[PDB]
Amino acid sequence: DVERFKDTVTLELSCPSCDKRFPFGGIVSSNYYRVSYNGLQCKHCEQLFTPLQLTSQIEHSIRAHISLYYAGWLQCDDSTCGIVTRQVSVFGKRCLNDGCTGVMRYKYSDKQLYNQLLYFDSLFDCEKNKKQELKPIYLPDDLDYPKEQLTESSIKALTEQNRELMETGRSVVQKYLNDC
């Protein structure tokens, strides 16, 4: 789970009122947002997301990823070549550079897509939120590293208070995970 999400990218949410953009890492610390007892709250303007305001963005990101995936970019193995192209030879694995012996692979592999969706799923997984098993959204030297750390007992409580929101966010990921 640790290594599985190492190359996934963050879910970026935008605030409906004030338009500030931020990564959403689950019920975890952040200088941008707070999961309060009545839902996801923007720290810059204090406005609460509604469920539809959150889930429409989850779904939009998912679909951006799925669309990139279907763009079908390919990349060559050979470090001295490396070309990226959407051209597919009738021998698929064969590189289109005259004489290059490298192997071609879909640059967004279906393993990567599946991992990206499983990461999104983890964000809205209550048991994982409570056990604090989610991947951090910030490295320690990041200028936006969170100033306040949440407590375990706050996370437990806040997670149960927001169960319904979480499960509904999670169902939107599952729409595409069972279809994969």
Partner: protein, 433 residues
């Protein structure tokens, strides 16, 4: 089918396109396979060759010309090798990336294939009907003409969630136009709508319980209005890969699930994207990726350039026998795209090898209806414009089939059958919505 992309399988499909056209060319022009040879190597002799138009570099400039194209051969034809095309001896042409083509020519010196002539791909056959079938169809309609209305999303503007225009339209079709069938193309809830994209979704005071997801937004916003379409009007829904309500965001795209949309069985059918079907005798071919916007021709010649772009593009589609023949498919730059699922391009080929009587491929270009090679080609245009101004829709009115009126053509053979001549009997109006 799941979200798997398998390179071997995708390449199989691309190989098979070249091979199946090789057989179509050989049967049509009555040539022997010994007349076909590998154009990627030097010969002293003129040869026939079939292949796919590809760029001459795999990392290529956005803008191609007649000096920067190659032909890709099949695995059996030329071990899949690609050879640069010398088009200098050919004055009139229209090519595009992914096109399968047939040439007569020669590779004189090893590094170029000089095209001496283009063997045009033959147009696919048209469907036919028996006299009995046409008489039943005549009885169905009780004299009167067949009416089919066609709309295409988006159905609401970019800055609001009003379906007032759709309500006005529904009232009109229920109580004035009274068509037999209504065909509605997505997107219904477009995932790239800017308020949907940004999550700037408001509270709806006209809903007792707010939707929590885009699927619920469809049930509260569209379903109640769609439900008001008269049960006498059969209504067909065909999705877009931009439909938030679909969970299959690749072309070809599985049909929506009607029960999930809570639409009544009495008059709603959900079809695949693409799909082909008959309304009475008329064969429809419907596809919801914007071929007309996306197909970028490389052109030479005064006669080719003086023709209408929409005619040329429709002929390419008929020749290629698939609704979106461009490959690689287009990309919107990442936001959206054709999203081709290459392994299943098979399903996007003309069903039965038949050309449709009516071909409907909605586009963001201006609405149009045109006859090309005896096929009625229709773009109904977007139902509403982004700004909220009136868009358009298409009305198709077809004279009732009559074996006595002459407008149907008897095809000669022991078993007597008739060409629908829909183009001779159909009127298409493009109406402000």
């Amino acid at each position: 089918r799941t979200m798997r992309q398998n390179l071997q399988e995708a390449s199989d499909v691309l190989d098979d396109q070249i091979e199946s056209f090789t057989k179509i060319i050989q049967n049509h022009y009555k040539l022997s396979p010994n007349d076909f040879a590998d154009p990627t190597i030097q010969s002293q002799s003129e040869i026939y060759a079939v292949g796919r138009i590809v760029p001459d570099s795999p990392t290529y400039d956005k803008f191609l010309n007649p000096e920067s194209l190659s032909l890709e051969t099949s695995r059996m034809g030329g071990v899949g090798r690609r050879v640069r095309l010398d088009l200098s001896q050919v004055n009139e042409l229209s090519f595009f990336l992914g096109q399968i083509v047939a040439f007569k020519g020669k590779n004189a010196n090893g590094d170029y294939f000089t095209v001496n002539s283009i063997l045009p791909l033959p147009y696919p056959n048209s469907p036919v009907s028996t006299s009995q079938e046409l008489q039943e169809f005549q009885a169905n309609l009780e004299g009167s003409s067949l009416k089919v209305i066609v709309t295409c999303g988006p159905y609401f503007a970019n800055d609001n969630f009003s379906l007032e225009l759709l309500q006005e339209f529904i009232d009109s079709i229920n109580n004035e136009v009274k068509p037999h069938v209504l065909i509605m193309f997505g997107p219904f809830i477009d995932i790239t709508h800017p308020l949907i994209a940004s999550g700037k979704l408001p509270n709806f005071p006209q809903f007792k319980t707010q939707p929590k997801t885009l699927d619920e937004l469809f049930l509260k916003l569209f379903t109640p209005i769609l439900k008001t379409i008269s049960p006498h009007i059969q209504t067909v829904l065909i999705p877009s890969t931009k439909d938030a309500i679909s969970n299959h965001a690749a072309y070809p795209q599985a049909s929506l699930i009607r029960k999930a949309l809570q639409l009544p069985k009495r008059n709603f059918k959900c079809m695949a994207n693409p799909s082909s079907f008959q309304i009475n005798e008329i064969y429809f071919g419907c596809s919801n990726v914007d071929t007309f916007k996306d197909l970028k021709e490389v052109i030479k010649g005064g006669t080719t350039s003086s023709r209408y772009r929409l005619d040329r593009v429709s002929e390419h589609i008929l020749q290629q026998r698939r609704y979106y023949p461009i490959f690689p498919g287009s990309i919107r730059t990442h936001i959206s795209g054709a999203d081709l699922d290459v392994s299943y391009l098979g399903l996007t080929e003309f069903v039965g090898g038949f050309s449709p009587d009516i071909m409907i491929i909605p586009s963001e270009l201006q609405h149009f209806a045109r006859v090309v090679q005896n096929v009625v080609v229709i773009n109904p245009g977007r139902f509403i414009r982004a700004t909220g101004n009136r868009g358009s829709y298409a009305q198709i009115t077809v004279q009732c089939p009559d074996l006595e009126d002459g407008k149907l053509t008897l095809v000669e053979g022991e078993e007597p059958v008739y060409l629908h001549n829909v183009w001779k009997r159909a009127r298409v109006d493009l109406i402000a919505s």
